[PDB]
Amino acid sequence: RSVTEEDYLKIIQELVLYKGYATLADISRSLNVKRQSVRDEINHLISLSMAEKIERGKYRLTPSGDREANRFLRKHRTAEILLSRCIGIPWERVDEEAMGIEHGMTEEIIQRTIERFGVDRCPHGNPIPDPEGNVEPVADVRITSLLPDSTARISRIVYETDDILHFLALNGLIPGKDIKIESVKDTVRVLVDGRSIEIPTDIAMAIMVTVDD
Amino acid sequence: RSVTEEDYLKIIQELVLYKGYATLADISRSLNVKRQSVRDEINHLISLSMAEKIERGKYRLTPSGDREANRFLRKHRTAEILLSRCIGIPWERVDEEAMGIEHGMTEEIIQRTIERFGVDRCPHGNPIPDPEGNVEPVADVRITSLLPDSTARISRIVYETDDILHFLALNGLIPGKDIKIESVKDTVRVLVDGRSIEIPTDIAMAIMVTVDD
Ligand SMILES: [Fe+2]
Ligand SMILES: [Fe+2]
Ligand SMILES: [Fe+2]
Ligand SMILES: [Fe+2]
Numbered sequence: 554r555s556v557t558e559e560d561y562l563k564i565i566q567e568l569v570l571y572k573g574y575a576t577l578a579d580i581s582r583s584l585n586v587k588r589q590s591v592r593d594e595i596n597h598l599i600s601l602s603m604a605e606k607i608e609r610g611k612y613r614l615t616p617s618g619d620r621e622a623n624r625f626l627r628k629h630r631t632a633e634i635l636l637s638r639c640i641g642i643p644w645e646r647v648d649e650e651a652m653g654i655e656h657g658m659t660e661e662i663i664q665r666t667i668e669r670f671g672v673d674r675c676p677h678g679n680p681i682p683d684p685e686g687n688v689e690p691v692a693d694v695r696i697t698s699l700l701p702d703s704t705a706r707i708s709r710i711v712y713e714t715d716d717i718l719h720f721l722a723l724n725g726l727i728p729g730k731d732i733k734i735e736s737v738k739d740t741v742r743v744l745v746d747g748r749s750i751e752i753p754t755d756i757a758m759a760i761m762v763t764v765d766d
Numbered sequence: 767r768s769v770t771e772e773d774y775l776k777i778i779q780e781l782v783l784y785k786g787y788a789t790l791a792d793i794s795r796s797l798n799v800k801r802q803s804v805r806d807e808i809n810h811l812i813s814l815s816m817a818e819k820i821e822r823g824k825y826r827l828t829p830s831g832d833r834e835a836n837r838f839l840r841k842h843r844t845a846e847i848l849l850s851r852c853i854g855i856p857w858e859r860v861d862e863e864a865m866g867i868e869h870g871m872t873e874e875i876i877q878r879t880i881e882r883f884g885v886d887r888c889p890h891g892n893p894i895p896d897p898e899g900n901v902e903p904v905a906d907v908r909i910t911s912l913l914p915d916s917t918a919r920i921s922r923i924v925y926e927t928d929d930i931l932h933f934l935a936l937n938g939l940i941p942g943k944d945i946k947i948e949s950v951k952d953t954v955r956v957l958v959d960g961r962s963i964e965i966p967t968d969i970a971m972a973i974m975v976t977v978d979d
Contacts, residue, residue: 554870632867635848635852635853636875638852639848639851639852639853639879639882640848640852640875640878640879640882641878641882642874642875642878650872650874650875652870653867653869653870653871653872653875654845654866654867654870654871654875655870656866656869656870657767657865657866657867657868657869657870658866658867659863659866661855661863662849662853662855662863662866662867665853665854665855666852666853669852669853669854
């Protein structure tokens with residue numbers, strides 16, 4: 554697939570949940586689009602009241618751009634469920650592979666997929682928005698906000714890159730797994746499945762967790 | 767989805783297998799596109815050596831247009847298998863619903879779907895072409911070419927409209943079912959599952975069968 558508006562909405566929403574803002578160069582690098590085209594699209598989104606400038610070089614979605622993103626992510630996330638549950642596309646690959654089929658996911662397909670597998674989250678734990686673009690508020694927090702000896706459950710991975718998902722899969726840090734914070738100096742080190750894992754800051758920033766209970 | 771070149775290739779291939787040719791008005795009606803746009807696309811296909819005029823008002827694909835159609839139908843037919851086997855989209859609806867997700871079916875998805883379900887035909891029995899656009903020749907014939915008392919097995923439905931598939935499903939005339947020709951005057955009447963069914967000519971023309979054995 555070549556790049557669409559919906560791809561811009563998704564990456565901008567991810568970067569904002571991940572680090573608090575989207576830059577042109579971060580969008581350029583994720584979408585593999587030249588900066589100047591990224592600039593034209595951002596300005597177009599701003600003129601449509603779907604994005605706004607936060608300060609210099611830093612952007613985010615407006616509330617209405619966020620709902621539009623959400624209507625797309627309903628398609629995206631359901632496509633991931635379809636691909637991973639029906640045909641065994643690996644957990645860490647399924648974000649990339651959903652890219653083809655997601656644009657044409659109809660409500661017929663989306664709803665039958667949701668009811669057939671009994672899910673309301675993508676395999677990476679992000680909730681599936683409703684058709685209007687609403688998502689239920691989830692009570693979770695950044696794993697980087699936790700003190701040593703905190704116990705928690707991994708909730709969702711808000712930014713789904715290859716390096717990130719591969720690390721998480723390799724170390725079994727997946728939605729639903731109980732973890733315990735061992736250390737927070739330089740990296741975030743946790744206890745999971747009796748094993749100890751150092752999570753570098755760039756990866757830890759993408760991990761949301763729910764604190765018991 | 768709005769209309770693409772691939773949609774033109776598919777309907778033209780179907781109409782040719784069905785009645786021996788495609789007219790502008792038949793393409794217009796199937797794709798819901800005004801005749802003039804259908805005309806521009808046909809001329810474009812002709813200039814690309816993907817279609818040719820047979821005689822007045824009658825068109826078909828060239829060999830190379832047929833292979834291109836086939837590369838698309840690999841996507842289409844696999845999408846149908848995915849949708850009907852993974853999530854239970856009804857047999858008679860699955861041709862329409864594949865329309866969204868088919869354009870982005872990658873070889874990764876296509877191949878894992880084929881191996882996961884163990885299929886080399888769509889639910890309506892049409893073979894799944896290979897990535898290059900080849901299909902294995904199938905030894906089947908039109909049900910309208912058969913004499914009374916012939917026995918056969920339904921092979922494929924080469925033209926998949928709503929009226930056609932609905933009739934076939936309603937009367938259990940599906941790939942694999944054994945049938946016996948009872949009569950060929952006005953309609954084609956067959957014996958299937960101990961029941962007798964009159965198949966009108968417009969529907970019978972789309973049914974291929976293999977004569978035993
Ligand atoms: Fe994703
Ligand atoms: Fe996901
Ligand atoms: Fe079909
Ligand atoms: Fe089919």
